[PDB]
Amino acid sequence: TLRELRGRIRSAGSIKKITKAQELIATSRIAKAQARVEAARPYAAEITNMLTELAGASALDHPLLVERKQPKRAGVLVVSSDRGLCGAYNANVLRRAEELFSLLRDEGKDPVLYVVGRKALGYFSFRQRTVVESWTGFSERPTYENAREIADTLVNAFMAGLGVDELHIVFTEFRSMLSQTAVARRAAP
Amino acid sequence: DGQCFLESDLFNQGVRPAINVGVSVSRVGGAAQIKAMKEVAGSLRLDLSQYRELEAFAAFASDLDAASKAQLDRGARLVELLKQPQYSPLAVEEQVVAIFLGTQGHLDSVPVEDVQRFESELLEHVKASHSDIFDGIRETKKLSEEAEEKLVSVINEFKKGFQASDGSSVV
Amino acid sequence: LADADAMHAKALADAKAESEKVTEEAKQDSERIAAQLSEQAGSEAERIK
Amino acid sequence: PAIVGDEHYRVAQEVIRILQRYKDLQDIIAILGIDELSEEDKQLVNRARRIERFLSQNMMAAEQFTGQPGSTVPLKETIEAFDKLTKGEFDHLPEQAFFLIGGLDDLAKKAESL
Amino acid sequence: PAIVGDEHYRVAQEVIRILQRYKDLQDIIAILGIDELSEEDKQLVNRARRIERFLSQNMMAAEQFTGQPGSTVPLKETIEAFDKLTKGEFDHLPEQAFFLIGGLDDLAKKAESL
Amino acid sequence: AEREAMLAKTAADNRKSAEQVAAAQADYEKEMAEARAQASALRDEARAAGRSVVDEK
Amino acid sequence: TGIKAIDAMTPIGRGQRQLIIGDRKTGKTAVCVDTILNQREAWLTGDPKQ
Amino acid sequence: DLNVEIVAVERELWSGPATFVFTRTTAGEIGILPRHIPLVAQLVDDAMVRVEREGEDDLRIAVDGGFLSVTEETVRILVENAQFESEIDADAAKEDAASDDERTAAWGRARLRALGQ
């Protein structure tokens, strides 16, 4: 009916403006995020250099460098969004996380979940696997105070052995504005 | 008994003739199409329709699996293979070879910026020597086993003889 | 080092020999294409006449 | 259900509920694509797209266009297949596995070809 | 390229490409400013700004107001001028050097006097 | 100085052996690519000469 | 027809009807003129069946 | 001769030349001059830095959980958070030093120490 179609052209003509605005806001924020990545990079390089020098002098008997006697459990940290509209970003993270689970349970470790973001906390609220701890309010603007708490909680869960024999992180690696993928890294041991 | 729906979006992008597959079809055709053409083109309609959907999807994805990416790059080279200039009707003995190049994957070493020139030089080379391929197709309607091996022995000699406008020689 | 330099001398001799084969094949290729376009020129002049 | 029996009618309402819900999401799907849906809807649309493609068949009359032969699927193997689909048994198989295929044995074969 | 020469068709398709990129980038230019663009995109916008200026002409209708005579640019000079301009051969000239100008010899005359 | 120079020359000659093997491959493929490109330029020159006789006729 | 796309994907048999539907200035005439031009390779042979 | 950097987990926060820089570490208070051995040390929980160079008068700093790395040619100091004496507030630092949370009390003392008290 023409009245319906006129309304739908009015609707779609509003949405085209609101999505074109958020394409341009996301085009601002990728530049700010790349600035904060390249500002956090020189510290990460110098802490790696300092840690290489200390490991050169050390006996290396620090717990985070050694395998547990029985592979009882594994931690997975999954990093994901609070905002929607991100597209396949969370689909890719959550698919790579479920693939990591298949490999871990193939070795015999059951995963235990730590989650950053509200979308993955929704996904693991629908699929009946528990989350041990979560964080939500900062995925678009993470601050070191947040990563301090996450890394403390992960290291406490590794050193507790109610504890994990290894732990991993699943997140998307930014490699260009046109190319990113979900990746899985073992952070400990 | 069918339609060749010419899409103005494809025509403005420069795909000419602008045959919009899936919505274009022939419902009598396939009975009358000569056996060699029917052997080479027997999947090409389906391979182009699945390319149009796969591209309309993947143009807004960061990355995809290697089998899908191979199907996409094949499809984009088949689209560059099918276009041709006005008032240049090809004889069927030249059409079936031009579609053999693309469907059998011999274009997979050639970049999308050179593919139309690659077919244009190859179809003159095979018109100048090895012409028993074109003559055989014309006089028996069939791309026989002994014409197929004699074609693949010539396409590889031409691929080493060819150089893209950017990148290396082909293989 | 004598094996490596012997392989360099061998590879340069092989490359010049097959380069001579490619350029000889191209002398045929340039006549072969020029003949087909000369036949096209005669056919087009016949069409006009 | 009085005429086709309960197991047919249950399946033929579960299939229609699913495709109806997918068609009532199509206005969002057209703009944003799949991932912006909620997980209870995204679960549904993933099976809806499989059910939608699995209602295709290689017909006896299609042989004059596709060259492939035609298939016949008995009513019992039809009900069973859509019962398993609507209960979610096949959600790990890709959408391309379901196109133009006759029955469960031929679905299994096509999935193993991929 | 049948009715006009291949060179004319190529130059016009390239001018359209450069102006199509710039008409896409004008949203970023207005919302985020020129500094948001890469070195390759600012190298394009520098050419695109100059191309859209070089499409302007001092013409025999404007003789009424400016007193300066209107200019005719031959087709061959127009093609050759936009071929050199799209290949960037005037990037070191400011935009004001391209406004209201009667071909390539006249561009040199405005640009050296500016 | 001789015993030090013997191991110095042995390690240098081995490093140059690996470099000379790489240079054998790189010269072989560089000559091959230059010759094949020259064949394409010769055919292309003959195709343009063919076009020139077509329009001349 | 002597068009690669059409003789590959939508082959025109003799006594078929084949609709060259499209928009304005889309080459509909150029597909038909290419089809009519192509037949000269058969018209030179005097037999009424080619 | 020496060059100095102060670096934070998220920023290259400050850098200049150096000819005297001083730090207090779980081993004690230590100065570093234009030639010094390679050193690694951890700064105290309530820790402050003073940075001095041949080009100009020195600079005064508060640091949280810092680490120090030296070689005679280059010096780098690596920090969880840092605040300059021109940006530390005396009422906020005094309030933080009165707090019951151990890191906040240490950071309060760190900012009080950069404020010369």
PDB file of N, CA and C in Angstrom, chain A residues 35-36 39-41 43-44, chain H residues 7-12 80:
ATOM      1  N   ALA A  35      46.295   4.856  18.041  1.00  0.00           N
ATOM      2  CA  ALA A  35      47.153   5.723  18.838  1.00  0.00           C
ATOM      3  C   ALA A  35      47.432   5.112  20.219  1.00  0.00           C
ATOM      4  N   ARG A  36      46.415   4.631  20.951  1.00  0.00           N
ATOM      5  CA  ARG A  36      46.605   3.983  22.267  1.00  0.00           C
ATOM      6  C   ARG A  36      47.388   2.665  22.176  1.00  0.00           C
ATOM      7  N   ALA A  39      50.987   3.763  21.672  1.00  0.00           N
ATOM      8  CA  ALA A  39      51.451   4.371  22.912  1.00  0.00           C
ATOM      9  C   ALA A  39      51.723   3.330  24.018  1.00  0.00           C
ATOM     10  N   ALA A  40      50.960   2.237  24.077  1.00  0.00           N
ATOM     11  CA  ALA A  40      51.190   1.112  24.982  1.00  0.00           C
ATOM     12  C   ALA A  40      52.306   0.162  24.515  1.00  0.00           C
ATOM     13  N   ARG A  41      52.674   0.191  23.230  1.00  0.00           N
ATOM     14  CA  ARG A  41      53.713  -0.665  22.634  1.00  0.00           C
ATOM     15  C   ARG A  41      55.135  -0.484  23.196  1.00  0.00           C
ATOM     16  N   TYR A  43      56.299   0.356  26.181  1.00  0.00           N
ATOM     17  CA  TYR A  43      56.352  -0.288  27.487  1.00  0.00           C
ATOM     18  C   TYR A  43      56.404  -1.801  27.354  1.00  0.00           C
ATOM     19  N   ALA A  44      55.522  -2.388  26.547  1.00  0.00           N
ATOM     20  CA  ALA A  44      55.490  -3.835  26.359  1.00  0.00           C
ATOM     21  C   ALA A  44      56.822  -4.363  25.804  1.00  0.00           C
TER      22      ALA A  44
ATOM     23  N   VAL H   7      58.158   5.938  31.167  1.00  0.00           N
ATOM     24  CA  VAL H   7      57.286   5.160  30.310  1.00  0.00           C
ATOM     25  C   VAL H   7      56.264   4.548  31.221  1.00  0.00           C
ATOM     26  N   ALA H   8      55.046   4.506  30.752  1.00  0.00           N
ATOM     27  CA  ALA H   8      53.908   4.036  31.474  1.00  0.00           C
ATOM     28  C   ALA H   8      53.260   2.986  30.589  1.00  0.00           C
ATOM     29  N   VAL H   9      52.667   1.988  31.216  1.00  0.00           N
ATOM     30  CA  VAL H   9      52.013   0.853  30.564  1.00  0.00           C
ATOM     31  C   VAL H   9      51.169   1.184  29.322  1.00  0.00           C
ATOM     32  N   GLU H  10      50.683   2.425  29.231  1.00  0.00           N
ATOM     33  CA  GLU H  10      49.858   2.990  28.164  1.00  0.00           C
ATOM     34  C   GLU H  10      50.471   4.185  27.392  1.00  0.00           C
ATOM     35  N   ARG H  11      51.627   4.733  27.789  1.00  0.00           N
ATOM     36  CA  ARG H  11      52.208   5.977  27.227  1.00  0.00           C
ATOM     37  C   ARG H  11      53.741   6.002  27.272  1.00  0.00           C
ATOM     38  N   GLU H  12      54.403   6.589  26.283  1.00  0.00           N
ATOM     39  CA  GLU H  12      55.755   7.136  26.480  1.00  0.00           C
ATOM     40  C   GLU H  12      55.597   8.508  27.148  1.00  0.00           C
ATOM     41  N   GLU H  80      53.341   1.750  36.205  1.00  0.00           N
ATOM     42  CA  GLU H  80      51.923   1.457  36.137  1.00  0.00           C
ATOM     43  C   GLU H  80      51.068   2.729  36.010  1.00  0.00           C
TER      44      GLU H  80
END
